[PDB]
Amino acid sequence: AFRPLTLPPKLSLSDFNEFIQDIIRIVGSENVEVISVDGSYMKPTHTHDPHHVMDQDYFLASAIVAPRNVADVQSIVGLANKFSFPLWPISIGRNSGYGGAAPRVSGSVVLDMGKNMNRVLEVNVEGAYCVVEPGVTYHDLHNYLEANNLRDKLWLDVPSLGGGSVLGNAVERGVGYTPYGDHWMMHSGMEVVLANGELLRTGMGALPDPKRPETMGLKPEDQPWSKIAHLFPYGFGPYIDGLFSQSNMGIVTKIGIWLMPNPGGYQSYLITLPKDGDLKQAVDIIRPLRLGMALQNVPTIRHILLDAAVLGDKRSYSSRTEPLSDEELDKIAKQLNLGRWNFYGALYGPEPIRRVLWETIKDAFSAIPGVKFYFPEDTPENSVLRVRDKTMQGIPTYDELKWIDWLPNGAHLFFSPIAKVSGEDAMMQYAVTKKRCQEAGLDFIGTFTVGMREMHHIVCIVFNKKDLIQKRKVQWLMRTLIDDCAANGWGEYRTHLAFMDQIMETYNWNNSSFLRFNEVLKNAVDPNGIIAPGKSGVWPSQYSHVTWKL
Amino acid sequence: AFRPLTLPPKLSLSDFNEFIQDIIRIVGSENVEVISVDGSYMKPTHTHDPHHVMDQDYFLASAIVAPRNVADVQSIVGLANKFSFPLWPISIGRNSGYGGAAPRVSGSVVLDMGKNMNRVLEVNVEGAYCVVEPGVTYHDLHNYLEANNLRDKLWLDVPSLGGGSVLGNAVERGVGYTPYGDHWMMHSGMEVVLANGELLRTGMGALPDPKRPETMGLKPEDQPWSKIAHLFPYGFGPYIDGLFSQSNMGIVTKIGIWLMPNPGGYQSYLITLPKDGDLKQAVDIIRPLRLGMALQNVPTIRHILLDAAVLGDKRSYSSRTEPLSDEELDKIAKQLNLGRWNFYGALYGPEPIRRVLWETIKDAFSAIPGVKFYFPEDTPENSVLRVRDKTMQGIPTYDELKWIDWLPNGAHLFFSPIAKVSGEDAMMQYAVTKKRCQEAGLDFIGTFTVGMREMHHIVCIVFNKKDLIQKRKVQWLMRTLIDDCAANGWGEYRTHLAFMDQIMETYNWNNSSFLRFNEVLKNAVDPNGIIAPGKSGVWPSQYSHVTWKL
Amino acid sequence: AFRPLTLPPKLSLSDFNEFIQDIIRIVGSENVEVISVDGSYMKPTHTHDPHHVMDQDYFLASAIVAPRNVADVQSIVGLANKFSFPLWPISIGRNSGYGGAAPRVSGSVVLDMGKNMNRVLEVNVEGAYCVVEPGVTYHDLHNYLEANNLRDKLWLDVPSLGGGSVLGNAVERGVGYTPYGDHWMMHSGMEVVLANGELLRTGMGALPDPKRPETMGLKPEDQPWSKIAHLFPYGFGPYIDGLFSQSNMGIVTKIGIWLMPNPGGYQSYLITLPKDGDLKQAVDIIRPLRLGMALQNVPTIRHILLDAAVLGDKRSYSSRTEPLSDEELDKIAKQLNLGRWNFYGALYGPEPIRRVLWETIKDAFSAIPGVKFYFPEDTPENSVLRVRDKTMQGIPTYDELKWIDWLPNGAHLFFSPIAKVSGEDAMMQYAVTKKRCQEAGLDFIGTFTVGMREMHHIVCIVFNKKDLIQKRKVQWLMRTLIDDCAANGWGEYRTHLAFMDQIMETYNWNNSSFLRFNEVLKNAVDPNGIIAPGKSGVWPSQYSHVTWKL
C-alpha cells in the first residue's frame, strides 16, 4: 500500500513503497496494513496511543507488520537495514497508560509479534517453568494449563488485568501479586533477534542441546533448548539478559517464565485502614513483615478512590466535576465498608504455617485504631477482595478495567515513582503527588505495590481523552510530578512514550553517565538505528536530540 | 511541475521533479511555482532581478516555494539536504538595487517566507517592542498599531519606502531615519532554522519560558518566549546574533524589533545649502552635532538631483541625454527652492528641549552663506520635506519610488561605501564617485545618511534596463567605483548579487583572513552547502570559486 | 621549569617540559612562571581564583605565560596546537566574583596578555574613539588622556572599580554608568588571534589601509587600520564580532572603544527611597523615564547594605553573625541618611537641557512618600554619591572595593540574573533572591543597573573564604538561585567558572539547540580544543561532558 499518513525520517515515498511491497512478498498482504481508531482493551489498536495525552495521532505508525515466524523478523530487519526504516516491536500492544502500542518515532512500522507468534511452547512440570512467545497472553496461558489439568500442579503470576503479554510484560519489568510477582526476575533463557538480524539466546540458552537424529536440520529458531536453559539464568560470562528489559537492543521471540508450584494452601485477606494518615503507620508495620517473610506475595495498599472507581464511575458517587473532598472520601469509604487506605495480601502454604503468619500479621495491624479484617467470604458479591483473590492465586480477570471509567472518556496514564517501605517516605511521596493532583483538578487515585525493600507507587491519573484543556493539565501534571519527585530523591520505574526523555534526564548522576554509556551500546549493536529509536530515551546517533527529544 | 529554465548545479531533471513533487505534498501546489516578468515594487517579482544589470535571467530561480509555517521550512530544508538543492530565502523580495528577490546561484528555489509567515506576533507596550515574522511589512506594522490605537504610545522606524520587510530589512543591516534608525541594533531575540534544520532562538530567546498548563504540547516554533527575550539581546555566552545579518547561516523566522515610545513632541526641518561645495562645511558642522546629540535621528544630506527626481523624471527638466551641467544643477535647485545639497532632520521631545537643540542647530548652520531653514508648512504641497516629515516620525509612504523614474526604464543599483563624518573625507568620496559617473555618462545622484561617527553614502545609480550599452557602463561604473573607493580606504556596507565577490575581495586584510574564517563557519553549520551559497561572497566547499565567482 | 602542581588533561610531564622550554625560547624566562597566594585587587593573582568558593586550588594554572607582542601569541598558539595544551587568556585578571584569572580547566597555561601588551594605541578626537590593548586598564586610559589634556575633549565610561581592562571588560559584556555604559555596544574593530593562529580584524578592520611608503613591510599586527575601522562596526557580510564576547573563539589583541565627548555640563544626584518596598513604585517610575531618555546613563538602584558596607564592615554596624533584621536595616539607613533603596543618576548637557530633565525626574519621584534629593555637595565627605559622581563622569576610583570587606575574609561572588524594568518583576526577583540569602545565612546585598528595557540585578554575595561551612552554603545558595530564577523566567548575564555549565544548561530551549550550535562553531575553528575549553559551557569535542561538567 501506497501513501501513509506520516513517514519515518529521511525516507522517501518511493523507498517506503518498495519496502512495503518487499515486506508483502514475505508475510503476505494478510499480515501487513498501511495507515493512509482507539479500539478497546479487549481489542487493542496497534497504530497509535489509545490513552492519548498528546494529539491522538502524535505517536502514529506508518504501517502495522506482523511476522509469521522467527524467520519473518530476520528478513524484516534485513529490510529495515536496507532502507533505514524504524521498527517498533510489540507483543500484544496492551501497554496503555504507557503508550499502548504506539511507536516513539512517528512513521515507524509497528511489528506485531503477537498475532502470529502465539504459542505456549513448553510447560515443564519438574523444572516448574514455561517457554512462551510474544503472543501468549496471560489468559491464554491460564487456559493452556486448564486444558491439560496442570492447574493443580502449577500456578501463574498475573498483573491486575489478564490480557497482557507474559513476555511483553516481563521485558517491561512488570509487576504481579503472588510470591512470583517480580516478573522480570522469574525469567530464564530468552531468544533475541538483534539489530543486525542474528538470533541469540541468553544464559543457558547459549548451550547447544546436543545432536540427535530427531532434531537434525531444524532452523535455529525451532531447535530445542539444552536441559538447564530455563532453570539457571546466568549461563557463563557476561549476563546480558537485562540489556533487553526496557530497551532498544533487540526483538524478543521466546522467553522462559518460572512457574510457582501449587503451594498446598491459600487464603486472601483484606485489612482496612480507616484514616487517610494511617498509611504512615500501616507502612511502618509492613517494613519488618515483608523483610521477614510473613508477607509472601506483593501485597498492595490501595487508595479509596482506586477501589471506589472499580465499583463505579465518579458520576455514581458525585455530580461534582472538581476533585472530591476529604469528607466525601470518608463517606464513600464508609459506603463500601472500606477504609481510606486498604491493604490486600494472601497467605500461601500448609494450614499450620498459614495459621502462624496470619496471627502475626493480624496482631501487627491491630495497632491501628479501627482496622477491620475481611476474607473474600465476608465481602459483597462485587467486592475488590473477591477480584483480587482470583488475582493473588494466578487467575487472570478483567474486573479492574472499570476504574479507567472514572471520568467520561477515561484514559489512564501512570506516574510510577518508587518509594521507601517506610511511613514517612510514603506520606512525603503521597503529599507531593496529592498536591499536584489537586492543582491540576484531578482526583488522586493510586496503589503502592510492596516489593521487598521498595514500593512501586502507581499514581493512577484518569482523564478525559476528548478534553484539550484537561490533556494539557495532565501533561503539566506529569512533568511537574517528574521534577518534584526527582527533587525528593525518587525516580519513576516505567513510563509513557512522551515522558521517557524527561525521566531519562532525571537519571543524570555524574553528567548523565548512565545514558551516555547506553548510547554507546546502542550505536554499536544497531549501526543503522533501526530498532525502536527512543525507548527509555536512548537515541541512536542518527536521531538528533534537538529534533527528537520530548 | 516538470522542466525548469535553469537547474541548480549537479542536479538532474529526475531529482528536481522528485523534490518539487515532495515539496508539493508538504506546502500544496498553491504554494509552489516552477519557472519553465519584472513586476513592480508594489507587486514584486520573486524569480529574478527586477532591476537587472546582468541579463535579466542571469540570476534566475528554478522555482518559487512558500512555506505555510515554521514546520514547512524544517521539512523543506530536510528535502534540500536529501537532494543538495540550494535555497535562497526571502521575506518580501523588495531588495531591488541589491538583487531584488533573485538568488545568487541560478537554479535555486527562492523560499518566499513572506507570503504565509505574515503575522505581527506581539506588540508589547511596557517593554516597548514587537515580534514580527518575515511577512510583516512596514506598512502592515504601521496599520497593526493604528488598528489597536497604539500609535499614541509607540512609533516605528521606517526606510525611505514602506513596503520592505521589518525582518528582512533588519537582517540586511538596513537604515531608517528616527532615533531608532539603525535597524539591526534595535533587535532582540531571533528565531532561526539552521542548515541542519534545527530551530534556535538567540540571546534571551534560549531561556525557556517556564512550564504552565496553557502552553503544554506546543510545537517549538509556537511556544511563548521568556519575559527578557526581547528586552536584553545578549543572553549568556557567545552572542551569535550577528552571524545572521548579511549571511548564509540560517533561515530567520521571527525577530523582536525595539519600538520608540511617543516622545511627546516632534518637528521636521529642512536646511538648504546653496553651493555644491558647501557639503564640506556642512559635514564639519554635523560632526560635533551628531556626536553631541543635538542631532537625534539619522538626518540625511541629499544631492539636488535626488530631490529633483523625486518631483519629476529628467525629461521634465531637460531633453539632454548626457549628464546635466553644473549650471543646470544650480538652475534646477533654484526652481524647487532647494540648494545644491539639502540637509533633512527632525527634533524629538518636549518643547523646552526641542527649542534649545533647534536654536543650537540653526546657529551652527548659519555659518554657511545663503542657507535657508524650512519646516513642512513652509514648502509646496509636493515637497520632499512633507514626505520625509512622515518618514522621520515612523509613517511609511511610497512617494520616493519616483526618482527610480529618472530615465526611461529606470532601474536603481546602489553603490554604498561608508565615509567619515568629515567634510574633507566626504568631498573626496564624492569627488571620486562623481568622476566615474560622468565617465560612464550618468548623472550623479545620492544621499549621505549620517550615523553617529560614520556616513553611509548611497550613490543612486539610475539606468535604463532595456539598454545593453548602458547596462555595460554601470557594470563598468560599479566595479571601477569598488576599486577606487577601496584604494581610498572606504568599503561598501551592502550590495548587489553581482558585486558581492568583488566587495568581499575588498575586505582582504591579512590575506583575506576575514573571508577564510567565514568559510570555516559556513562549511561547519552547512555540510551540504544548501542555504544560499554566495551571499556576501561566502561559498561553501562544493561551489568551486573558479566556477562561481563574479 | 620542571614539575607543576596540576597538569592539563592527557599531557605527560615530558611533553609539558618540552613545551614550557619552547615557550621560554620565545618569551624569555622573565615572561614565564610555573606553579610547583591570593594577592589583592591592586596586585592580582593570575594562577587561581582569589575569591574562591571551591577549594582555592580547584581552578589552578599549571603555568603563567605572557607574550611580548602579537607574534608571541601566534607562536604560543602554534605550540599549544602541537602539544594540545589548553590556553586561558586574560587581560588583567581582575574578574573576581567571576573566577578572577583562573582557567576553567585546571592545568592550562594562563595567558597574561596585559603584562606586555599594554599600549593605548590611538586616541582619535574627531572620530571620538580609542584603540586599546589588553593591558590598558581604565586608570591608565584615564591617565593617558590627562597626560595629553584630552579630558576637556573626551570622557570615558568606567565600571565601579578602575583597575579593570577596557578590553577584557568589553569582551565580557560588562557595564558602566555614563551614556556609554554598555561597554560591548561601544566597540568597533577588534583584532583576533584564532585557534589556528591567524590574525583577523573584524568589521571595517578587514578593509586594508592602502599602501603608502611609510607602512611597507610591517607585520600584520602592526599595520595601521583603514579610516572607517573604528567608526562603523558592521563592515560587510556576517557580523562575527559577537562570537568573541563571553566565548572561546579566539584571543583578542586590540579593540576600539568609542568615547563620549565632553557634554558641556554635568551633575550627579541621589534620590533616596525610604521603604524597602518602595523599589516597586521606584522601578515603575523609572520605566518611562529610561525609555524616554530623561534617564541618560545607567542609573543604579542600590540596596542599603550595599551602601553601608562601602562605608564600613559589618562588625562596625553589628556584632551579630546571622543576617541583620528589617528594623536594623532601617536603623543603619537612618544612620547614613540613606533610605532602604537608593537611586543614583546623573544629568548630562547644556544647563537649559539639564534643568528640564531634572525637574521632570524630581517630579516623578516625588510620588514616593519621604523621598529626598541630594547632590554631591549635600552629602558627607565619605559618601557614596561623591564616589559615584566620579564614577558617572568617567573617572575611575577604588573606594567601592570596601564592601567586599563586609565579613572577615570577604570574597564576593556575583549572582546576576536580568529583570524587567517593572516594579512587580523586580520585587519578585528580589523576593526570591532575598529568601535564598536568609536560608543560607547571608545578608542580601545588591544593585540593579538600569538598562534601557532591562535591569541587571547584581546580587552581591560576600562570604568568608576561610570558612568551609560557609563556602558550601554559597555553592548551595548559587545553584539554588540559578534554579529558582530559571523557574521564574530569568537567566544570568555572566558568571563564575563553577556556575557556567549550570547557567548554560538554563539556556536550553528546544533541547539545548543554542549550546549545540555553539559546539559546532567551536569544534570548527578549534580542531584541537586549545583555546579555553569550558568558557560559558562550550566544550570542544575532546573534553567529555561526563568528565568536565560542573
Ligand SMILES: *Cc1cc2c(cc1C)nc1c(=O)[nH]c(=O)nc-1n2C[C@H](O)[C@H](O)[C@H](O)COP(=O)(O)OP(=O)(O)OC[C@H]1O[C@@H](n2cnc3c(N)ncnc32)[C@H](O)[C@@H]1O
Ligand atoms: C491500564 C493498565 C495497565 C496495567 C495494569 C493495570 C491497568 C488498568 N496493571 C499492571 C500491573 O499490575 N503490572 C504491570 O506490570 N503492568 C500493568 N499494566 C501495564 C500493561 O497494561 C500491562 O503491564 C501489560 O501486560 C503490558 O502490555 P503488553 O504486555 O500487553 O503489551 P506490549 O505493548 O506488548 O508491551 C511490550 C513493550 O515491551 C517491548 N516489547 C514487547 N514485546 C517485545 C518483544 N517480543 N521483543 C522486543 N521488545 C518487546 C516494547 O518496548 C513494547 O512497547
Ligand SMILES: *Cc1cc2c(cc1C)nc1c(=O)[nH]c(=O)nc-1n2C[C@H](O)[C@H](O)[C@H](O)COP(=O)(O)OP(=O)(O)OC[C@H]1O[C@@H](n2cnc3c(N)ncnc32)[C@H](O)[C@@H]1O
Ligand atoms: C529601491 C530602494 C531600496 C531601498 C531604499 C530606497 C529605495 C528607492 N531605501 C532603503 C533605506 O532607506 N534603508 C534600507 O535599509 N534599505 C533601503 N532600500 C533597500 C530595500 O529595498 C529595503 O531596504 C527593503 O526593506 C529591503 O528588502 P525586503 O526587506 O523587502 O526584502 P528581501 O529581499 O526580503 O531581503 C532580505 C534579504 O535578507 C535575507 N533574508 C531576508 N529575510 C530572511 C529570513 N527570514 N531568513 C533568512 N534570511 C533572510 C536574504 O539575504 C535576503 O535576500
Ligand SMILES: *Cc1cc2c(cc1C)nc1c(=O)[nH]c(=O)nc-1n2C[C@H](O)[C@H](O)[C@H](O)COP(=O)(O)OP(=O)(O)OC[C@H]1O[C@@H](n2cnc3c(N)ncnc32)[C@H](O)[C@@H]1O
Ligand atoms: C570585585 C568587583 C568586581 C566588579 C565590580 C565591583 C567589584 C567590587 N563592579 C563591576 C561593574 O560595575 N561592572 C562589571 O562589569 N564588572 C564589575 N566587576 C567585575 C570585574 O572585577 C570587573 O568587571 C573587571 O573589569 C573584570 O575583569 P578584567 O577585565 O580586569 O579581567 P579579566 O580576568 O581579564 O577577565 C576577562 C575574562 O574574559 C575572557 N577574556 C578576557 N580577556 C580576553 C582576551 N583578550 N581574549 C579572550 N578572552 C578574554 C576570559 O574569560 C577571562 O577570564
